[PDB]
Design an enzyme around this catalytic site. Structure first.
Site, mmCIF file in Angstrom:
data_model
loop_
_atom_site.group_PDB
_atom_site.id
_atom_site.type_symbol
_atom_site.label_atom_id
_atom_site.label_comp_id
_atom_site.label_asym_id
_atom_site.label_seq_id
_atom_site.Cartn_x
_atom_site.Cartn_y
_atom_site.Cartn_z
ATOM 1 N N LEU A 52 -8.954 -11.491 -31.547
ATOM 2 C CA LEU A 52 -7.840 -11.539 -32.443
ATOM 3 C C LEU A 52 -6.877 -12.673 -32.049
ATOM 4 C CD1 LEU A 52 -6.860 -7.793 -32.610
ATOM 5 C CD2 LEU A 52 -8.547 -9.083 -34.122
ATOM 6 N N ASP A 56 -7.487 -17.338 -27.956
ATOM 7 C CA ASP A 56 -7.754 -15.903 -27.639
ATOM 8 C C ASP A 56 -7.808 -15.678 -26.122
ATOM 9 O OD1 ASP A 56 -8.217 -13.218 -28.133
ATOM 10 O OD2 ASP A 56 -10.485 -13.547 -28.406
ATOM 11 N N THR A 103 -29.837 1.597 -27.373
ATOM 12 C CA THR A 103 -29.875 2.663 -28.338
ATOM 13 C C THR A 103 -28.518 3.300 -28.594
ATOM 14 O OG1 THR A 103 -32.041 3.029 -27.742
ATOM 15 C CG2 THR A 103 -30.917 4.818 -28.813
#
Ligand SMILES: *[C@@H]1O[C@H](CO)[C@@H](O[C@@H]2O[C@H](CO)[C@@H](O[C@@H]3O[C@H](CO[C@H]4O[C@H](CO)[C@@H](O)[C@H](O[C@H]5O[C@H](CO)[C@@H](O)[C@H](O)[C@@H]5O[C@H]5O[C@H](CO)[C@@H](O)[C@H](O)[C@@H]5O)[C@@H]4O)[C@@H](O)[C@H](O[C@H]4O[C@H](CO)[C@@H](O)[C@H](O)[C@@H]4O[C@H]4O[C@H](CO)[C@@H](O)[C@H](O)[C@@H]4O)[C@@H]3O)[C@H](O)[C@H]2NC(C)=O)[C@H](O)[C@H]1NC(C)=O
Ligand SMILES: [Ca+2]
Ligand SMILES: [Ca+2]
Ligand SMILES: [Cl-]
Ligand code: NA
Ligand code: NA
Length: 806
Positions: free
Chosen positions: A689, A683, A159
């Site tokens: 990235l 990576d 949640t």
């Protein structure tokens, strides 16, 4: 300390929160045990309940009542939401025909349509259809506004990670809320659902929508509500704020419901007890819409009805126990349930070893219902590694299961029947999205999309500039009637070189050999044409990828494929080829098994060499354009060029070869031709990235050849598969993957079997969006199509999930 002796008189649900020790009267004061002594009496009135009745109509105002039905209640902004229906002969909003909202119909003094976010915890996507008979208000929002058949939450499908990603546009690894329980080793502090640590601002990173709005002079309602404030009071509070004078009134509001999650955990997603919570949430929506219709705002406000995650059937008996696998169970701390996170119980224990824990947990029982991973080896689509709060060892739990440390944890903590938190591509975890109002489209279905994209749209709805985030702004333009955001394509930063023939064969000393010296003006001109790019329109269908960082690279053309060859990484950044439905698969001929050919367009200094692979006993090599799919025997020689070679562990070659020899042609057959773009990804710091040259941790032994952490492929064809991929006039269809380049297949418990029983299963788990590859490579794809740029942005965010029908 709080001086609770202050008063809430005229401060009920005040918007600016006051600093301790001053007592509070805002919607979260209860959570902090800091409300003024008279908050319940003044601010949480309940007398006479929530609905007008005929006898109350025109009553004398009694300030004690929860809500009012006196003639003055409209000017006061505090009628019961059904006031006009009961007392003034009006209809409920749900009973009115829908009618397109072509333009905002707002009261004077309204500078923009307000945005109301109505968030529901646990609201599984299939409730929209399965519960439609008991949710008439929600059904009218859905059918009349814009809706998706589902919206994908972020991992873990918990949640707070998902509400906060809704609010920020960020992955959990970037906003910092990476689970409902966390330990931060730098803070040496723990975050739990219960308690006060979780209120500390250092956990919550990024810039959530209320702060973005506030910094740009848009006023915001306070988003979160203490659990004990009944839903009816939350709605009345929002309606009362909407009646504030123009200079005081917020423009963005949030409602939150703990249902249907609360009951779903107790009864399972489809327990018969679930009908009532669904009814109750629909009634709450009805109160809001009736209240907006009373304020003449029901054709002015943009409403978003959105869930954070779904709900799966999970019972105590489906629990795996680490005590059944590990000898050393008391030396670990496990964050348990629908995901596992492991770290050392004590940082002073120098006998703790992650490798031995991973091995003890890897394919040890036949039906094992979790799989361990080092976090950098999790599917890149989860974006779940670049945060110090994410433990190195992760357990991906199968849907319908839990992991726990010891049996006593499960009966000395069956109760529950539902839970969530599983991989975000799991169908039971999917949730809802409906947008309704003047800025959304009318009666429009949009394809499923990820919840990370919504912050940008909520910013567009409010005229705000979004803080940097992980959405792809413009990809959800097709949800909107107006306020679209018209991005421009990024500028190419490096232009390619186009080398011709510049080296003689004897200049190379790469230790390579090839049986290719068996030898015509008909064919010689033609081979020269191919090397200058005469077949490029067949193989490069959507333009060349643009390189969005500074580097030195060459475009290399061939009969069957084109590539962008990096002189820095000594291999292609991308290789592009098209395989028609009619293509034939051939073998690598015996005389060519070990062939590698110098490329006379590329200097020996910027080439790989075969001697490094001979000497590196762990590393072998593969090819980006597959020799199996050569157009002719003569064209096949191009496939063994040293500029087409990349480093591959033998275990990974099993995967790759099967993909190339079997799967590509299977996809071409099914999709009426495919275009494939493949390449390496580096990576090593698992940030999602592209790595720079100085970040590379592993090279082929003795050389400067970097070893990729992953290999990608992007497989594009025509959405209308009656047209061949290379002659497609309309929308495209894509699937892509980012396979981890690992030296074993321990991830695949069935890998001793023929590749037909496990490889495609591996590839599906490592399914990716084009956008994930763009982040990982610094490339920008689909630059030259006939499609609108926002349509291509939607295509780049697509994820092919392989799940059955919702
Ligand atoms: C999803 O979208 C997001 C948002 O766009 C992308 O995240 C951005 O990526 C950038 C690159 O990774 C990163 O830019 C860096 O910012 C540094 C300053 O950071 C602070 O300021 C910003 C702005 O307000 C703030 O948002 C940051 O918030 C992070 O950290 C705090 C904790 O302090 C958390 O509360 C918060 O949740 C967030 O954590 C996340 O990001 C950090 C990294 O910032 C991670 O550590 C966490 O794990 C977590 O994921 C910060 O408060 C800046 O200093 C960096 O610059 C260094 O590198 C450059 C290279 O160009 C160099 O020029 C600089 O000199 C500098 O190097 C020096 O420091 C090095 C490291 O200490 C050292 O090795 C050197 O030798 C030098 O001394 C860099 O510019 C940006 O901050 C984040 N933003 C966010 C919100 O996460 C994300 O990439 C997207 N994801 C994908 C897959 O696309
Ligand atoms: Ca829950
Ligand atoms: Ca990286
Ligand atoms: Cl958690
Ligand atoms: Na080798
Ligand atoms: Na295996």
């Amino acid at each position: 300390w709080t001086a609770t002796s202050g008063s809430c008189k005229g401060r009920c649900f005040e918007l600016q929160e006051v600093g301790p020790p001053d007592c509070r009267c805002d919607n979260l004061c209860k959570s902090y045990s800091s409300c003024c002594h008279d908050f319940d009496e003044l601010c949480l009135k309940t007398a006479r309940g929530w609905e007008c009745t005929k006898d109350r109509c025109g009553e004398v105002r009694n300030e004690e009542n929860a809500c009012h039905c006196s003639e003055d209640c409209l000017s006061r902004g505090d009628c019961c939401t059904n006031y006009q229906v009961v007392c003034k002969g009006e209809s409920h909003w749900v009973d009115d025909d829908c009618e397109e909202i072509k333009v905002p119909e707002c009261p004077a003094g309204f500078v923009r349509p307000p945005l109301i976010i109505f968030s529901v915890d646990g609201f599984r996507a299939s409730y929209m259809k399965k519960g439609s008979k008991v949710m008439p208000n929600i059904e009218k929002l859905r059918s009349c506004g814009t809706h998706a058949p589902y919206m994908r939450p972020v991992y873990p499908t918990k949640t707070f990670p998902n509400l906060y990603t809704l609010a920020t546009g960020l992955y959990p690894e970037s906003h910092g809320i990476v689970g409902n329980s966390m330990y931060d080793p730098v803070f040496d502090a723990s975050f739990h659902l219960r308690g006060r640590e979780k209120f500390n601002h250092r956990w919550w990173g990024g810039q959530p929508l209320w702060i973005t709005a506030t910094k740009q002079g848009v006023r915001a309602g306070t988003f979160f509500w203490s659990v004990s404030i009944p839903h009816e009071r939350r709605i009345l509070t929002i309606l009362q704020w909407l009646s504030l004078p123009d200079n005081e009134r917020p423009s963005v509001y949030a409602f939150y419901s703990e249902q249907p999650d609360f009951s779903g955990h107790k009864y399972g997603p489809f327990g018969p007890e679930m009908t009532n919570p669904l009814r109750e949430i629909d009634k709450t929506v009805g109160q809001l819409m009736d209240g907006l219709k009373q304020l003449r705002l029901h054709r002015c406000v943009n409403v978003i009805f959105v869930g954070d995650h779904g709900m799966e059937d999970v019972t105590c008996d489906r629990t795996e126990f680490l005590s059944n696998y590990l000898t050393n169970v008391d030396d670990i701390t496990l964050v348990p349930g629908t995901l596992g996170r492991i770290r050392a119980k004590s940082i002073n224990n120098s006998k703790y070893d992650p490798k031995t824990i991973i091995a003890a947990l890897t394919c040890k029982k036949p039906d094992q219902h979790f799989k361990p991973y080092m976090k950098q080896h999790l599917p890149k689509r989860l974006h779940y590694a670049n945060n110090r709060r994410i433990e190195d060892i992760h357990l991906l739990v199968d849907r319908r299961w839990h992991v726990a440390r010891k049996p006593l944890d499960v009966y000395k903590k069956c109760f529950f029947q539902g839970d969530h938190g599983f991989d975000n591509k799991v169908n039971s975890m999917q949730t809802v999205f409906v947008g309704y109002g003047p800025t959304f489209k009318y009666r429009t279905k949009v394809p499923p999309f990820e919840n990370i994209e919504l912050y940008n749209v909520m910013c567009d709805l409010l005229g705000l500039k979004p803080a940097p985030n992980n959405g792809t702004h413009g990809s959800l333009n097709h949800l909107l009637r107006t306020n679209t955001f018209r991005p421009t394509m990024p500028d190419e930063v490096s232009r390619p070189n186009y080398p011709g023939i510049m080296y003689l064969q004897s200049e190379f000393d790469l230790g390579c050999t090839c049986d290719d010296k068996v030898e015509n003006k008909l064919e010689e001109l033609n081979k020269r044409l191919h090397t200058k790019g005469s077949t490029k329109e067949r193989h490069l269908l959507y333009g060349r990828p643009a390189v969005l960082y500074r580097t030195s690279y060459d475009i290399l053309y061939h009969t069957d494929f084109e590539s962008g060859y990096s002189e820095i990484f000594l291999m292609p950044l991308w290789t592009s080829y098209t395989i028609s439905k009619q293509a034939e698969v051939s073998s690598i001929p015996e005389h060519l098994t070990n062939c590698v050919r110098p490329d006379v367009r590329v200097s020996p200094g910027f080439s790989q060499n075969c001697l490094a692979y001979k000497n590196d006993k762990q590393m072998s090599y593969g090819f980006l354009f597959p020799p199996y799919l050569s157009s002719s025997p003569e064209a096949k020689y191009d496939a063994f060029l040293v500029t087409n070679m990349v480093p591959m562990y033998p275990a990974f070659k099993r995967v790759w070869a099967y993909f190339q020899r079997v799967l590509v042609k299977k996809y071409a057959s099914e999709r009426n031709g495919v275009n494939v773009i493949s390449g390496p990804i580096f990576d090593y710091n698992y940030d999602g990235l592209r790595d720079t040259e100085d970040e590379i941790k592993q090279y082929v032994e003795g050389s400067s050849i970097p070893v990729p952490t992953h290999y990608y492929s992007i497989i594009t064809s025509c959405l209308d598969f009656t047209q061949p991929a290379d002659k497609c006039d309309g929308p495209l269809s894509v699937s892509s993957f980012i396979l981890p380049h690992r030296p074993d297949n321990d991830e695949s418990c069935n890998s001793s079997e023929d590749e037909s029983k496990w490889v495609e299963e591996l590839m599906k788990m490592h399914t990716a969006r084009v956008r994930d590859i763009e982040h990982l490579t610094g490339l920008d794809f689909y630059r030259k199509t006939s499609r609108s740029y926002s349509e291509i942005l939607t295509l780049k965010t697509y994820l092919h999930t392989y799940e059955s029908e919702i």
